[PDB]
């Protein structure tokens, strides 16, 4: 299948967080608790799924060139849209917390307006227009980039949970272990470098 | 019907012969204060005081009501008290024959008592502090009540004495004790024992329950994790064979019954049999003239869960039914934990919570269903040498604390 | 210009659909008009604070004040009102401070509950009341060497409903005062004319407001009795300017005026029959006074009391007076005090030494019961540090020893 | 000038917050990229802090991120324009990191941190201090990683590499991902050594 | 410090008894299990070495080949003869020549930064670097640098283990964390056709890499011209990384520690069930292209470190699962990563050290899904 | 206030835009010119033209080069603006372009423009050589490649790869002058005129006509040149046009 197979490349062979290093903000602030974690992973899928398709129809149908006129190429108006199409979404999701304000609205808190800014959302919707990714291919990759990334938030925010049972020297303890694990993660993230889609 | 798999018998020389004979008199008797859960004395007695059989000797300021009562009669000689003036014990000098006597019921009448009296009678005779809660393995309180008392009519310690030879010797008082528990509880009793047969109540509410397999066995906190799932909205009471005959017989006679019968097995024991004894007998006049010379240590209870008889400790536990006496001679998980551990819970993740001091994780791993016991063999096994008996204490007096 | 304005109709119009989205996740996903916050059971102590997340911002707002030193942020946790109904879940913030079984009651921070539905709250009564006495000066009198006993006469011939052990609230304004201006009496100024304390001056550029223990018992109707101590720079600290109002108290003679506000206080005897124990020193001995005054004149408990003060020299006590009169004429009361240097003119032949170990001799080391008895200190803080340490090794619980920390 | 210097070591945007890792870890391979892109984040930083606040007192909570990005963006757009036409070659290099400007946390969080509840001329200064923290990290990483990686620092050889006639024989991972995750993890380490205020707490 | 009074019963109610087990007996236990593995991996070390050479040189250009390189030369100078007629003595003799500098290099290096954090930290040395050091030895090939084998121990222990508390305190693998070090940061010395065999001027591709280009069929010993059949493999009588070849002396090693309990069954039963599933299902697919898609499960259990790495390093007890129910999904993944890797990944032959450390990262999502789905049986008092 | 949040979101949406939309009208066309001399540099490079600056290589452009556009369907020239066609566009939609089959697409170019650009070098009124843009992915990213083939259409004048993305030193030496250099000289097309140009692992036999030696402990990296070369060097690429070139 072909979308097996791009789903499959957006989760591990592609993945946002550790095989690309975008996200990384967020990535390593609420890393700390899988169940919060998890709830970013969640609400992190839930906004890509919905931009990069999103972004394909504005920019095939409007902003692509040759789209609205011929010999009117608005594509300059991609990184503006884009970006204004995932802090719209962003502004809901933000609302949202009325039914997750204790899970995530609080452990989040500054960051939850940051989501926007976060580079997988930006990144995912910018390889959808340089690559030809189908309606359909736009949500397989968004939903796959999605998943890649709360895959490893949650993979991190276990490997922390596992290390309170450690003497992390002072200093390193927080941001910089985190900033370490990150990087011995991208290691073992570093077995499909060669896989071919 | 229940049988486990996952555990460990030790294979520790010197087992019991199982033939009740009798033991070195005892003239020294003592209650251990560190022994009862969370409890603050308020001393009724000074040294030099003289006391009766089920006197009062102490009261729970933090458990109002509980009457912690003399085992016998004579003068008190002493009130140990270790750092922060925390009561070691209350040794007693067994000398005379007076006693506290109480009301005496018949046999047919057992069942149909009022709670209240029973709890009455219980709690000022002294025969209260017998039950303990799981969780937390504390006296229960005055006015609480339980669905679910736990009888632990087995024993899988290692060279503990065998039940059915003490309850045999008891039956009536047994069954009559069946029976007390029978009006005590809400709900039911599980009368948990091994295949072999004992001696049966006529009440509906009381259900006997086989658990055959290695040592956790016969640890009420594993019988009330397949039978009676405990929390802190479920709270279950537990008491051995020997307190259950001590119960029938207060209610019987209208007297405190003191009487054990504990074996004393070691290595170093010259002939390892059952012995009859008194509750909180002196282990240094029990186990006189009975070891081979040496450096020994005398143990309180089993070697797997047990005190160190030494000091203002040398006398016999209140929970614990036997003595053992020997020769003085991290959780890197290796399989070790899993395989003597028979619950469900996950042990190499619970110990590491109560290594870590995580209180509110190791409640939801089920540290609220455990007492000490539980985790000995975990204890035993452990590359890396963790107590974690007493790990799970300070996690739970933590968790009573805060809430 | 031309694909110039096609650009800039095709990007607000997009934008624009943007925000009719978010505006209609507005209208849907939150909904709101105004929110009623109850305090207590009154209808008139009552919030319509349009829903806006905080409650401690809603309820400054309305006229009630709790304590918020940090100003927000889950930091001071003074702020803390039982929201019954309402505020949904203790977040992890509060919980560092409230702890699991005060939340279950319903402890909870203002400053990180949000106000998102009518919620009911119970704020203790003692806030909505507080009242404003513009008093007179009677005496400011030396008690000890760095402590002056300051007597308001409260005007129109009422008086305070202050509790035993209780505090008020002294709202000085803006002064320039010079410690030479001090009535130091000669008797103790030989320290203070040899460390030259007179050169200090102090200055305030705003209006300041402190708290200070009464040491009149309730009993003590028209005057405000208090022990103030002079805030001079400290010894590890001598490069830092002087105390802001106990400066201003010092400076302060008789017919002057002082503006306070009160009652308030928690450091309450409790209602048992167990035997008090007192443990004062310094500025302490305000609120062991109120306490030992209240319970012997007015309440005329005959509970066991004792009282054990701390103070370096015969001259630093006071009150001497008033306590050996109450242990005289009442059996059940004792004091004491102990020198931690006595000096030559003295001719002390009491206890010498700290009071945590003048204590623990002479009373409680031989108490069969020292667990049983109610302790209530105030006192330095090295002091105060040094007694719990000793009580604690003797097995008293935390439940029965109520501090006063200043 | 104090409030400039405040985020290089005190507050800094990539040690003590956490925004702009992402183009930490991917320019940091040679000096020359992380120098431009530093200045690229300290002129679109300090210009939209600075036009965030003017109209602060004005924005609507509900669209105050697309009030914000939409400005975000519009100077990184317009910096990417400018790139293209003058500085060609410079712009090559920078690929996407350009586009990526706008997803520097950075950017958006000393925007809404700062530059909102906060003065224009302040917010500015505010702007330019964490580029310069952000810059402080990119040269640091980007130093060790050039060295090493390549052996060369702002293209000129410093250290010979075997294939030049030389002796040293770069380090692959040096020009990898993981190495910037390593060498910002043992920055922190020396910053929060020297810094014991901003130590986290067990 | 100082001594006081009186004693409270929490602790007289200690351990009275106690297992023989202990953190020293389990690792000296692990040290000595590879020794078997290490004792022939000299041997072969030195037997392919030298056939290399006889069948590169002759007379006195051998003689010239063997004055020029101190490995050759010291051999002949203890009584080893580098002729094709070496014995046993001689080839085990120029393996260790190979082996120890590599060995000594990490112990001394990596014990180096073990006792500088214990020192500074007031920590007591800990015995568990007896394995990294053996271990990463192990892994390498007989021509690492010794400036490389430095910088990769102290990767693999600082980076890896002590920045992160020291032994028992980590989540990764530290011994195969030094080889990632070395495999990305300098790759052409442990990759290639150049650094398995320690005949100068020598070009031979190991067996995966032959296999990779032509199936079955390309498996060849150049230095002797004979196919690599099975049974060498499984002896380890093949190029390759020293302690690896012999699939034979690892398993011998992994019977006794599996035995006394030190190294977990299910996590070996795991890697077992993963890769035959995922070898298997390569086979039926098949591929006219990919000659890997048809390695057999018994060669991929023969050929490169899937042996060494399943029963040594995948059994590591700190980086590994927790639950047993954990550990026989860890297991499994490391299995199915390294099929994947060595069959549909064109890059990296061997795909075990970068599986391990992707199936370390993963083993604490798996432990917690068993616990929360514990917590919720429990939530439900086990339906009593 | 809904009006409010109206106004400033559309007045500041419009208002943006004509900055940005004034900025990127405006500075297209130096754009324009500073792309278009990017390609006018690669292709004077590998021609063997030296030129420098951009007044030189526009002005030695245009004296010496002649884009052409070819129909690779059938290897014929065709009118059009040879100098802006976009192939990658062109390739990139399917009016002008086609979808490879797993057997046609030897390089991993998913798709292949109908019509594609190549420039002839002419040093008097005569075309001395022809310059061919060649694409296929490596390892690691699309290489993009422009290979001058001599009046034979058989022997190769020059090669420069001016866009790749590979690890520098095992891989990305396509960019090393040495390599590049090695392929002048060498043959296209065998003796029956087939893609035979060949990237061999361990070194060319020396005199090889169409052996270039591949990237030393980088086959991957060789491998996807040589399938750029087998898929461009063929009937579904240049193959026809050569053809007619070469004859
Ligand atoms: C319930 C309660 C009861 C109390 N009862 C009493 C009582 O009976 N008597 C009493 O005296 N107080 C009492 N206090 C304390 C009182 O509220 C004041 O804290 C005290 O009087 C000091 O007042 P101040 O404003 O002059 O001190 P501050 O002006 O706050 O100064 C305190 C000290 O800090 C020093 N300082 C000033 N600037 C610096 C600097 N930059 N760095 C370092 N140090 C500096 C000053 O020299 C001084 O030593 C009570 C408090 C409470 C809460
Ligand atoms: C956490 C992220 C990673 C941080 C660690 C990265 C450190 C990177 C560089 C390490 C230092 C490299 O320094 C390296 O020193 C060795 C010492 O022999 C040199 O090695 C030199 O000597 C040896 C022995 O005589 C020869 O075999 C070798 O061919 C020669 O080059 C290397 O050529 C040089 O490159
Ligand atoms: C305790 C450890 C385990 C004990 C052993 C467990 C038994 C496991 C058997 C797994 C199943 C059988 O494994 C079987 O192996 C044989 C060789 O033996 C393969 O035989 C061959 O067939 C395939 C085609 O189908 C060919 O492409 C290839 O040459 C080879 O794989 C079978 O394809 C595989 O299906
Ligand atoms: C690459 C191959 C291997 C990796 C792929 C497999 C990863 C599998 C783990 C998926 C992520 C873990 O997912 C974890 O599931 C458990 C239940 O089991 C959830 O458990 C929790 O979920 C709820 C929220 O729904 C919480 O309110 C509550 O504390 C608990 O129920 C964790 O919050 C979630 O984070
Ligand atoms: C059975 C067993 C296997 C081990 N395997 C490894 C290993 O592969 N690599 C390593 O560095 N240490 C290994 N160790 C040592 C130690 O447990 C390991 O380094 C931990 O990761 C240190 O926290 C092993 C120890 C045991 C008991
Ligand atoms: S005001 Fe400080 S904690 Fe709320
Ligand atoms: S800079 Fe913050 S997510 Fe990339
Ligand atoms: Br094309
Ligand atoms: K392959
Ligand atoms: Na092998």
Redesign the interface.
């Known amino acids: 299948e072909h979308y097996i197979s791009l789903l499959v490349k957006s989760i591990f062979i592609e993945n946002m967080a550790l095989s690309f290093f975008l996200g990384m903000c967020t990535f390593l602030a609420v890393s700390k608790k899988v169940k919060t974690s998890f709830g970013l992973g969640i609400a992190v899928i839930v906004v890509l799924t919905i931009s990069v398709p999103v972004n394909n129809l504005v920019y095939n149908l409007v902003l692509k060139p040759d789209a609205l006129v011929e010999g009117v190429d608005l594509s300059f108006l991609n990184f503006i849209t884009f970006i204004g199409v995932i802090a719209a979404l962003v502004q809901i999701l933000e609302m949202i917390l009325d039914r997750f304000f204790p899970p995530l609205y609080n452990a989040l808190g500054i960051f939850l307006p940051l989501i926007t800014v976060n580079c997988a959302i930006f990144g995912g919707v910018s390889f959808m227009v340089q690559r030809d990714y189908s309606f359909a291919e736009s949500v397989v990759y968004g939903f796959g980039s999605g998943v890649g990334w709360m895959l490893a938030i949650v993979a991190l925010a276990g490997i922390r949970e596992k290390m309170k049972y450690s003497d992390v020297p002072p200093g390193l303890r927080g941001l910089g272990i985190t900033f370490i694990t990150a990087g011995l993660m991208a290691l073992g993230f570093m077995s499909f470098s060669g896989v071919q889609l | 019907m229940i049988t486990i798999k996952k555990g460990l018998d ?1 294979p ?1 020389a010197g087992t019991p012969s199982q033939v009740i004979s009798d033991g070195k008199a005892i003239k020294k008797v003592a209650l ?1 204060g ?2 009862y859960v969370g409890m ?1 004395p ?2 009724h007695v ?1 040294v030099g005081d003289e006391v009766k059989k089920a006197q009062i000797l102490f009261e729970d ?1 933090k458990n109002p009501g509980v009457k912690f009562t003399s085992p016998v009669s004579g003068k008190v000689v002493e009130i140990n008290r ?5 009561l ?1 014990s209350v040794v007693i000098e067994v000398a005379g024959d007076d006693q506290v006597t109480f009301d005496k019921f018949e046999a047919n009448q057992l069942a149909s008592l009022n709670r209240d009296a029973i709890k009455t009678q219980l709690v000022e005779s002294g025969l209260w502090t017998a039950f303990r809660t799981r969780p937390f393995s504390k006296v229960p309180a005055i006015d609480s009540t339980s669905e679910a008392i736990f009888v632990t009519a087995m024993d899988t310690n290692p060279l503990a004495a065998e039940p059915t030879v003490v309850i045999n010797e008891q039956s009536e008082a047994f069954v009559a004790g069946l029976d007390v528990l029978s009006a005590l509880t809400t709900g039911k009793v599980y009368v948990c024992k091994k295949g072999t047969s004992l001696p049966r109540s006529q009440q509906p509410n009381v259900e006997e329950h086989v658990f055959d397999g290695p040592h956790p066995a016969g640890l009420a906190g594993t019988h009330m ?5 405990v ?1 802190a909205d ?1 709270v279950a009471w537990s008491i051995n064979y020997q307190d259950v005959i001590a119960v029938g017989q207060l209610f019987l006679t209208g007297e405190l019954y003191t009487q054990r019968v504990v074996s004393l097995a070691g290595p170093v024991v010259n002939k390892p049999r059952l012995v009859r004894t008194v509750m909180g007998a002196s282990l240094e006049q029990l186990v006189d003239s009975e070891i081979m010379p040496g450096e020994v ?1 005398i ?1 309180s209870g089993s ?6 008889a ?2 203002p ?1 040398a006398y016999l536990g209140r929970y614990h039914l036997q003595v053992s006496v ?1 020769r003085e001679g ?7 934990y ?1 395989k003597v551990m028979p619950l ?3 042990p ?2 619970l110990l ?1 919570d109560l ?2 001091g ?1 209180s509110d994780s190791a409640v ?3 540290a609220l269903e455990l007492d ?1 016991e539980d985790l000995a063999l975990c ?7 963790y ?1 974690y ?2 790990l799970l ?1 300070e996690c739970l007096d933590k968790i009573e604390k ?2 | 210009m031309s694909t110039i304005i096609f650009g800039v109709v095709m990007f607000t119009l997009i934008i624009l659909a943007l925000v009719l989205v978010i505006l209609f996740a507005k209208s849907k996903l939150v909904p709101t008009g105004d929110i009623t916050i109850s305090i207590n059971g009154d209808p008139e102590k009552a919030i319509v604070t349009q829903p806006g997340g905080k409650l401690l911002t809603a309820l400054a707002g309305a006229g009630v004040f709790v304590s918020s030193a940090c100003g927000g942020g889950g930091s001071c946790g003074q702020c803390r009102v039982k929201i019954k109904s309402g505020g949904g879940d203790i977040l992890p913030t509060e919980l560092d401070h409230i702890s699991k079984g005060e939340a279950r009651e319903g402890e909870r921070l203002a400053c990180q509950v949000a106000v998102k539905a009518d919620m009911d709250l119970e704020l203790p009564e003692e806030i909505f009341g507080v009242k404003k006495w513009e008093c007179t000066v009677i005496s400011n009198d030396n008690k000890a060497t760095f402590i002056k006993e300051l007597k308001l006469a409260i005007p129109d011939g009422e008086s305070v409903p202050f509790r035993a052990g209780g505090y008020i609230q002294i709202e000085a304004p803006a002064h320039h005062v010079k410690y030479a201006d001090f009535d130091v009496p000669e008797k103790y100024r030989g320290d203070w004319d040899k460390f030259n304390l007179f050169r200090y001056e102090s200055k305030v550029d705003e209006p300041i407001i402190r708290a200070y223990s009464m040491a009149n018992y309730p009993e003590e109707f028209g005057i405000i009795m208090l022990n103030v101590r002079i805030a001079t720079p400290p010894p590890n600290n001598p490069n830092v300017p002087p105390g802001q109002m106990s400066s201003y108290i010092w400076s302060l003679k008789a017919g002057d005026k002082c503006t306070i506000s009160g009652p308030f206080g928690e450091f309450f005897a409790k209602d048992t029959d167990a035997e008090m124990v007192f443990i004062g020193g310094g500025a302490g001995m305000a609120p062991m006074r109120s306490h030992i005054f209240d319970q012997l004149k007015r309440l005329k408990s005959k509970r066991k009391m004792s009282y054990w003060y701390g103070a370096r020299s015969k001259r630093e006590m006071f009150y001497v007076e008033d306590f050996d009169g109450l242990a005289a004429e009442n059996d059940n009361f004792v004091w004491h005090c102990a020198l931690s240097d006595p000096q030559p003119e003295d001719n002390w032949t009491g206890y010498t030494g700290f009071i945590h170990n003048v204590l623990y001799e002479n009373y409680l080391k031989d108490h069969e019961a020292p667990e049983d008895c109610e302790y209530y200190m105030c006192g330095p803080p090295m002091m105060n540090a040094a007694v719990i340490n000793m009580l604690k090794n003797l097995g008293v619980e935390e439940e029965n020893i109520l501090l006063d920390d200043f | 000038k104090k409030s400039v210097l405040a985020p290089v070591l005190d507050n800094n945007p990539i040690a003590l917050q956490v925004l702009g890792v992402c183009s930490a870890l991917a320019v940091t391979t040679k000096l020359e990229t992380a120098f431009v892109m530093t200045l690229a984040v300290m002129f679109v930083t300090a210009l939209s802090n600075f036009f965030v606040s003017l109209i602060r007192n004005h924005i609507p909570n509900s669209v105050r991120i697309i009030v914000q990005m939409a400005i975000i963006a519009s100077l990184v757009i317009v910096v990417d324009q400018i790139l293209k036409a003058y500085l060609y070659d410079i712009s090559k290099q920078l690929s996407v990191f350009v586009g990526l400007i706008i997803t520097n946390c950075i950017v958006m969080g000393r925007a809404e941190a700062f530059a909102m509840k906060s003065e224009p001329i302040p917010s500015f200064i505010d702007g330019i201090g964490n580029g310069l923290g952000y810059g402080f990290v990119l040269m640091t990483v980007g130093f060790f990683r050039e060295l090493l990686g390549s052996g060369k620092l702002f293209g000129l050889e410093v250290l010979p590499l075997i294939s030049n006639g030389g002796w040293y024989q770069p380090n692959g991972l040096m020009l990898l991902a993981p190495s910037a995750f390593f060498l910002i993890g043992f920055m922190i380490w020396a910053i929060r050594t020297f810094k014991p205020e901003q130590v986290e707490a067990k | 410090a100082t001594l006081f009074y009186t004693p409270g019963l929490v602790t007289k109610r200690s351990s009275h008894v106690r297992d023989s087990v202990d953190l020293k007996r389990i690792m000296i236990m692990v040290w000595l299990a590879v020794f078997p593995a290490m004792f022939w991996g000299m041997y072969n070390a030195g037997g392919q070495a030298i056939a290399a050479l006889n069948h590169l040189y002759s007379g006195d250009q051998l003689a010239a080949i063997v004055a020029g390189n101190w490995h050759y030369w010291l051999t002949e100078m203890l009584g080893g003869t580098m002729s094709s007629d070496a014995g046993w003595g001689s080839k085990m003799l120029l393996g260790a020549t190979y082996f120890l500098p590599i060995y000594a290099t990490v112990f001394i290096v990596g014990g180096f930064w073990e006792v500088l954090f214990c020192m500074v930290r007031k920590h007591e040395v800990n015995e568990g670097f007896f394995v990294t050091s053996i271990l990463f030895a192990l892994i390498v090939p007989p021509t690492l640098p010794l400036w490389q084998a430095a910088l990769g121990i102290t990767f693999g222990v600082v980076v890896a283990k002590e920045v992160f508390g020291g032994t028992g305190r980590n989540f990764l693998n530290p011994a195969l964390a030094g080889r990632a070090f070395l495999f990305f940061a300098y790759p052409a010395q442990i990759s290639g056709d150049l650094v398995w065999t320690a005949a100068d001027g020598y070009s031979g591709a190991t067996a995966l890499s032959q296999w990779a280009q032509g199936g079955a069929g390309a498996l060849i010993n150049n230095a002797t011209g004979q196919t690599i059949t099975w049974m060498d493999a499984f002896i380890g009588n093949i190029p390759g990384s020293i302690g690896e070849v012999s699939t034979l002396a690892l398993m011998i090693g992994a019977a006794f520690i599996v035995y006394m309990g030190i190294a977990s069954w299910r996590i070996i039963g795991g890697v077992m069930i993963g890769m035959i599933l995922l070898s298997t299902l390569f086979n039926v697919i098949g591929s006219d292209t990919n000659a890997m898609f048809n390695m057999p499960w018994h060669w991929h259990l023969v050929l490169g470190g899937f042996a060494f790495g399943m029963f040594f390093m995948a059994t590591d007890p700190v980086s590994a699962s927790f639950t047993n129910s954990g550990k026989w999904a860890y297991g499994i993944l490391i299995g199915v990563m390294c099929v994947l890797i060595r069959v549909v990944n064109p890059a990296y032959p061997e795909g075990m050290m970068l599986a391990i450390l992707f199936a370390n990262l993963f083993a604490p999502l798996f432990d917690h899904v068993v616990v929360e789905r514990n917590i919720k049986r429990r939530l439900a008092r086990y339906g009593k | 206030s809904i009006k409010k949040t109206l106004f400033v979101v559309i007045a500041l949406s419009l208002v943006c835009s004509i900055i940005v939309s004034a900025a990127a009208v405006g500075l297209r066309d130096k754009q324009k010119e500073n792309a278009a001399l990017d390609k006018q540099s690669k292709i004077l490079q590998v021609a063997g033209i030296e030129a420098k600056g951009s007044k030189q290589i526009v002005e030695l452009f245009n004296k010496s080069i002649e884009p052409r556009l070819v129909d690779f369907n059938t290897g014929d020239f065709v009118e059009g603006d040879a100098a802006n066609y976009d192939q990658r566009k062109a390739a990139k939609e399917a009016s002008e372009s086609i979808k490879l089959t797993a057997e046609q697409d030897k390089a991993k170019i998913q798709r292949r423009a109908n019509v594609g650009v190549v420039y002839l070098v002419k040093d008097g009124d005569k075309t001395s050589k022809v310059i061919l843009p060649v694409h296929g992915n490596g390892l690691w990213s699309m290489m993009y490649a422009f290979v001058a083939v001599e009046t034979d259409g058989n022997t190769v004048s020059g090669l420069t790869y001016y866009e790749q993305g590979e690890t520098p030193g095992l891989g990305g030496e396509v960019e090393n002058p040495a390599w590049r250099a090695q392929w002048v000289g060498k043959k296209l097309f065998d003796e029956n005129h087939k893609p035979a140009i060949k990237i061999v692992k361990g070194g060319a036999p020396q005199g090889s006509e169409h052996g270039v030696d591949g990237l030393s402990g980088a086959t991957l990296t060789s491998n996807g040149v040589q399938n750029t070369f087998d898929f461009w060097l063929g009937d579904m690429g240049f193959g026809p046009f050569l053809t007619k070139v070469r004859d």
Do not use: W
């Open positions: 030790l520790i251990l560190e022994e603050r308020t001393m000074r300021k270790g750092a922060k003036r925390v070691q994790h397949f039978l009676y799932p929390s479920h240590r143990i070697v797997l869960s047990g005190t160190k030494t000091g400790h020997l991290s959780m890197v998980p290796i399989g070790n899993e469900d819970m996950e190499t993740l590491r290594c870590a995580d939801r791993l089920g000490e204890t035993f096994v452990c590359p890396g040498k107590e008996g007493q204490r805060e809430g």
